[PDB]
Design a protein around this ligand. Structure first.
Ligand SMILES: CCc1c(C(=O)Nc2cc(S(=O)(=O)NC)ccc2C)[nH]c(C)c1C(C)=O
Length: 126
């Protein structure tokens, strides 16, 4: 059984739109999305389809770029730090579940290298 995906909508949660959050959607997310190694991270891990019954038993805070993209588009975040935390969770999740050799890990590392260089250039709040 797959769990419910992370929430991308919640009217109770305080929301903001900031140039940093705009940057995260416009630059950071768009670069990673169009990348060739993006496809495994573009949606939640369907552990049923992939026959990974253990995945959600070990991964307790799942996160993927589809969810992140929805959150950015639906103005879900208060600050850039929340979004950055989601991207990092996604990478860490992948390193925890998989062995260091695996293709998925090489794909995550290439994406992360890209993520970390774009985050270096996260603008000061305006
Ligand atoms: C290796 C499984 C995995 C994916 C992934 O999605 N792989 C995948 C998905 C489909 S698919 O049929 O579901 N179509 C999209 C088909 C084939 C593959 C290899 N993503 C992450 C983060 C992981 C893990 C466990 O870290």
């Amino acid at each position: 059984m797959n769990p419910p995906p992370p929430e991308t909508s919640n009217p109770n949660k305080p929301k903001r739109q900031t140039n940093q959050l705009q940057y995260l959607l416009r630059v950071v997310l768009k670069t990673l999305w169009k990348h060739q190694f993006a496809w495994p991270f573009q949606q939640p891990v369907d552990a049923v389809k992939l026959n990974l019954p253990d995945y959600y038993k070990i991964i307790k805070t799942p996160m993927d770029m589809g969810t992140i993209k929805k959150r950015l588009e639906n103005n879900y975040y208060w600050n850039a730090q929340e979004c950055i935390q989601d991207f990092n969770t996604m990478f860490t999740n992948c390193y925890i579940y998989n062995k260091p050799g695996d293709d998925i890990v090489l794909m995550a590392e290439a994406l992360e290298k890209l993520f970390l260089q774009k985050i270096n250039e996260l603008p000061t709040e305006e």
